[PDB]
């Protein structure tokens, strides 16, 4: 009964990453010395290539262009061959993950991406695996992201009114699933070809308890953007809320509309201490013009938790003054016209990205590299 269910870890597609993983564990002319090993691949070895062949795989996509980078792979434009359709697909490197001991944030990536059903979240449509990568094939974002919007316009805040307030939609949605997205910035907001804003990069997302915190003993995120709280539990049992996130929009807000962000360093050390002196380091140019309103809003995002404007719901964040404008409602802004509207050539102009520049030893006894990987593969 639960086979069917895509949710559930023994469907399908999950009871086939499990034959295929050991197969690819096993197939060593070591460990075929052991008969209960040559047994089984001599009865399973043909089948399971075959099924290699019928199931989704990577050179189902041209690869027109790769627009991404990350700690762990990339994210290519393709263009599905048969369909003809076009894609976003991300590849996690199965080498790098495993030896950097970081093998377990991609599961509420996906999960995000494939169930929210959210106009604010990027949907994801087909994962699968080869026994190098993992891949997410998501829909496209021809708009590019928010680093490039803000390195080929001055942003008036005008325009910073409307992009923070579909970014606190975007979160409060996340939030209502249960989880924390601990790596806003601008390189994780991306625009469709309306210009209207999803969020992206969920790989540092953690669910929350009934009681709507977290423990964790870990910094995560981006130097910039990292908030106090989490920073300071680093040294041992951090016990923190979703308003984690509302002290990176004020980072957001500030570097939208003052053109740097506010606790820059030339040293990652450096940054870390002006966040922990931020009652003191936090300072605005005195050539700013910037607003009495937007300046209230990014001080009060850039304080203590205790004091943050957020802590107490995100109905308290709408009514800031700052919000208040003349083309959209908090209930209407994704069917109102965006700020930029991307003009697009082809289905696959990727003219808003700017262009871009190992594996296992052979075991000698059964490592199980593959296991961690069992039950990611998913279809729509
Ligand atoms: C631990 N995490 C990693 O190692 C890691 C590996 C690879 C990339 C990243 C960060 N990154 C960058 C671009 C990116 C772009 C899209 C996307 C979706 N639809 N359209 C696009 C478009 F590309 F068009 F913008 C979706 C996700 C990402 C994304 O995650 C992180």
């Given at each position: 009964?639960?086979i ?65 980078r ?22 996690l ?24 059903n ?115 539990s ?96 908090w ?23 700017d ?19 069992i ?6």
């Amino acid at each position: 009964a639960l086979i069917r269910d895509p949710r559930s870890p023994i469907n399908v597609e999950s009871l086939l990453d499990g034959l295929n993983s050991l197969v690819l564990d096993l197939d060593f002319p070591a460990l075929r010395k052991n008969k209960n090993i040559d047994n089984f691949l001599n009865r399973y070895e043909k089948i399971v290539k075959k099924i290699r062949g019928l199931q989704m795989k990577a050179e189902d996509y041209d690869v027109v262009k790769v627009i991404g980078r990350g700690a762990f792979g990339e994210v290519q434009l393709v263009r599905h061959k048969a369909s003809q359709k076009v894609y976003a697909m991300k590849l996690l490197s199965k080498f790098e993950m495993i030896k950097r001991s970081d093998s377990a944030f991609f599961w509420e990536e996906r999960d995000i991406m494939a169930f929210a059903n959210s106009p604010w979240v990027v949907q994801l449509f087909y994962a699968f695996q080869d026994d190098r990568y993992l891949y997410m094939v998501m829909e496209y974002m021809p708009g590019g992201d928010l680093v490039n919007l803000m390195s080929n316009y001055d942003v008036p805040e005008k325009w910073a009114k409307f992009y923070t307030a579909e970014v606190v939609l975007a979160l409060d949605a996340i939030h209502s699933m249960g989880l924390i997205h601990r790596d806003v910035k601008p390189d994780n907001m991306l625009l469709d070809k309306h210009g209207h804003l999803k969020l992206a990069d969920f790989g540092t997302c953690m669910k929350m308890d009934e009681t709507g915190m977290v423990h964790c003993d870990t910094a995560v995120g981006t130097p910039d953007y990292i908030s106090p709280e989490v920073l300071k539990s680093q040294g041992g049992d951090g016990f923190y809320g979703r308003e984690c996130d509302w002290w990176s929009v004020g980072v957001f807000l500030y570097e939208m509309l003052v053109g740097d962000t506010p606790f820059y360093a030339d040293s990652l050390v450096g940054t870390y201490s002006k966040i922990m002196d931020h009652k003191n380091s936090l300072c605005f140019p005195e050539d700013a013009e910037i607003s009495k309103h937007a300046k209230n809003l990014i001080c009060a995002f850039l304080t203590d938790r205790e004091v943050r404007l957020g802590r107490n719901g995100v109905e308290e964040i709408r009514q800031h003054p700052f919000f208040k404008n003349d083309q959209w409602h908090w209930d209407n802004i994704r069917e109102t016209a965006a700020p930029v509207v991307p003009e697009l050539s082809s289905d696959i102009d990727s003219s808003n990205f700017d262009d871009i520049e190992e594996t296992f030893p052979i075991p000698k006894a059964f490592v199980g590299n593959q296991l961690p990987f069992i039950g990611f593969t998913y279809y729509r």
